[PDB]
């Protein structure tokens, strides 16, 4: 302790949330000037956040506000259920909901208050000591239904679904959300399937005239929301039930932490 007290190190830690030793090092590095040391800790934080950039981020949560949906990732679920991480997520989704960002990099520079979303993440990352990633974002301008799903009761939601729609049967739209959340529908209608995925699946059926057509009738039933069997009643289909409801689905998305 060359030019400062130990109470000087407690305080510099209480303010930056950094590591006791890293704080002591920091102060002795500046020789007791306290302001330079705070900025000195910022430097190591940025180094250390870089060093763990190649790490994997398979735990976390998803967040929805006003037809914005985000997925924020960390390393362990201890961090995902920590209040400081959820508060960051709450902030970043609210950023996205208000600024309606085009892509993810748009949301990164959005303001969270006195710092951007990048800054707020990188700054929380350093205090925690885990990689943090804003993984994906989705904004729906229209009328939406959201459903957030917990895979473990005392964790944050790990599966999230936005469904943008036209209709007045509010419950009907929400019921679809479950159906997307549960059954991992990849496309809204038959037409939406890319033609180069249709060949990818018709070519696996050669490996395996009307046996090709059967497989695709099946894989269309798996991966198209309207061609799936309703979870409430598998006698009837998703599309069938919406028509009775008077509700049309314009588009939808489903995020799951760790999965694609």
């Amino acid at each position: 302790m060359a030019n400062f007290t130990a109470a000087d190190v407690k305080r510099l830690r209480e303010l930056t949330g950094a590591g006791m030793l890293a704080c002591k090092n920091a102060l002795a590095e500046t020789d007791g000037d306290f302001d330079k040391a705070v900025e000195a800790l910022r430097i190591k934080g940025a180094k250390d956040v870089g060093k763990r950039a190649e790490r994997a981020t398979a735990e976390g949560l998803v967040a929805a506000k006003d037809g914005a949906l985000i997925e924020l990732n960390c390393e362990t679920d201890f961090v995902a259920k920590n209040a400081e991480f959820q508060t960051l997520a709450d902030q970043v989704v609210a950023a996205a909901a208000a600024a309606k960002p085009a892509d993810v990099d748009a949301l990164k520079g959005a303001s969270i208050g006195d710092k951007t979303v990048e800054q707020a993440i990188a700054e929380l990352s350093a205090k925690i000591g885990e990689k943090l990633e804003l993984r994906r974002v989705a904004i729906f301008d229209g009328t939406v239904e959201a459903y957030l799903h917990r895979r473990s009761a005392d964790l944050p939601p790990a599966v999230g679904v936005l469904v943008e729609y036209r209709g007045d049967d509010a419950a009907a739209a929400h019921a679809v959300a479950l159906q997307i959340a549960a059954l991992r529908a990849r496309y809204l209608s038959r037409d939406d399937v890319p033609e180069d995925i249709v060949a990818s699946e018709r070519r696996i059926a050669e490996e395996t005239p009307k046996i090709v057509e059967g497989r695709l009738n099946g894989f269309f039933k798996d991966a198209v929301l309207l061609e799936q069997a309703s979870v409430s009643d598998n006698k009837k289909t998703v599309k069938a039930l919406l028509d009775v409801a008077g509700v049309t689905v314009t588009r939808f998305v489903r995020f799951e932490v760790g999965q694609a």
Partner: protein, 359 residues
């Protein structure tokens, strides 16, 4: 002689793994995973993640008799530390102690004092012993052979020995055997078989048979036969057949438990913690909802019950870990903590553990 399960919890960068290895080396230097001392053998359990720790304790794969918190002396605790401790409070580990790792790298002692109390306030925050053992260790220096530090690892393992209590032996709990088969040995009466789950049973004690059937039965055991020889007592863990006085073959069946009278009670409604197998684990392909009706396995037989989801739970998906209420069609012998399987026609689709009885 006694085995003891000790979890190690903490931040991966703080040396959780390294300090475990350091403990194995230090003890293997002393007596030339699992590591043992004078008093005990210890069994290592990890908690890499909260939720799939909770999965593992539901399935019984993991239980802690105590836990070591690993906090780096260099850094001091982290925001997550709050959550690590929280896991221990929630699954209910009986006692905690802390290992201030990397204590070689802190030259000024006032800082080591200082992280101590930080860690002590977290333990206190969360209803753990505030003046519990906090040990300064250097896993990486002890592995190198620095005796100052080797001695610290020895200090920490000595701390575990005094401060983690001995676990209760299964033969000191009240007697209970779940019934597997029921036979009549011609001219000697009916005999019920199984594996003594806990406690002991003696050749002329009196027992209660509980569950499945409408009314508990009370009688006395008339012979304890292991293999085909008659013994004077049957211990927890033993495979036994118990001859029951004047209890006809048709008035006992598997799923019943024979117990030491007044110790166990039948029940028909309960709250429970469950983990539902994913499709890739072999389980349900579809989610289930508010009026699910599978069979609940218990100890030796399935009993059909109707699930009720908690207010705010829309659906249960494969892979989910949540809570439910169950009303069984017939009563079954149960206590809090009891582990049960969720089955659909005989395939396990989920694993549960009873958390609150009703009725």
């Amino acid at each position: 002689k006694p085995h003891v399960n000790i979890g190690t919890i903490g931040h991966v960068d703080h040396g959780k793994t390294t300090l475990t290895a350091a403990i194995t080396k230090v003890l293997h230097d002393k007596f030339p995973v699992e590591y043992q001392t004078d008093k005990r053998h210890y069994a290592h359990v990890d908690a890499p993640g909260h939720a799939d720790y909770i999965k593992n304790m539901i399935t019984g794969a993991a239980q802690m008799d105590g836990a070591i918190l690993v906090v780096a002396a260099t850094d001091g605790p982290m925001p997550q530390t709050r959550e690590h401790v929280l896991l221990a409070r929630q699954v209910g580990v009986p006692y905690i102690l802390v290992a201030l790792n990397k204590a070689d790298a802190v030259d000024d002692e006032e800082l080591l004092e200082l992280v101590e109390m930080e860690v002590r306030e977290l333990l206190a925050a969360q209803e753990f012993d505030e003046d519990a053992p906090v040990v300064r260790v250097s896993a990486l220096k002890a592995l190198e052979g620095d005796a100052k530090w080797v001695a610290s690892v020895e200090e920490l393992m000595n701390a575990v020995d005094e401060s983690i209590p001995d676990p209760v032996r299964e033969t000191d709990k009240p007697f209970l055997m779940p019934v597997e088969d029921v036979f009549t040995i011609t001219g000697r009466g009916t005999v019920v078989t199984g594996r003594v789950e806990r406690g002991v049973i003696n050749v002329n004690e009196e027992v209660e048979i509980v569950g499945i059937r409408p009314s508990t039965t009370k009688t006395t055991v008339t012979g304890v036969e292991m293999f085909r020889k008659l013994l004077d007592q049957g211990q927890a863990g033993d495979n036994v057949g118990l001859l029951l006085r004047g209890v006809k073959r048709e008035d006992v069946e598997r799923g019943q438990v024979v117990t030491k009278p007044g110790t166990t009670t039948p029940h028909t409604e309960f709250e429970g913690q469950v983990y539902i197998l994913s499709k890739d684990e072999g389980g349900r392909h579809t989610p289930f909802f508010n009026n699910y009706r599978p069979q609940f396995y218990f100890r030796t037989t399935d009993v059909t019950g109707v699930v009720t989801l908690p207010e705010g739970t829309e659906m249960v998906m494969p892979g989910d870990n949540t809570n439910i209420s169950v009303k069984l069609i017939q009563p079954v012998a149960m206590d809090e903590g009891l582990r049960f399987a969720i089955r659909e026609g005989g395939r396990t689709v989920g694993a549960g553990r009873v958390t609150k009885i009703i009725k």
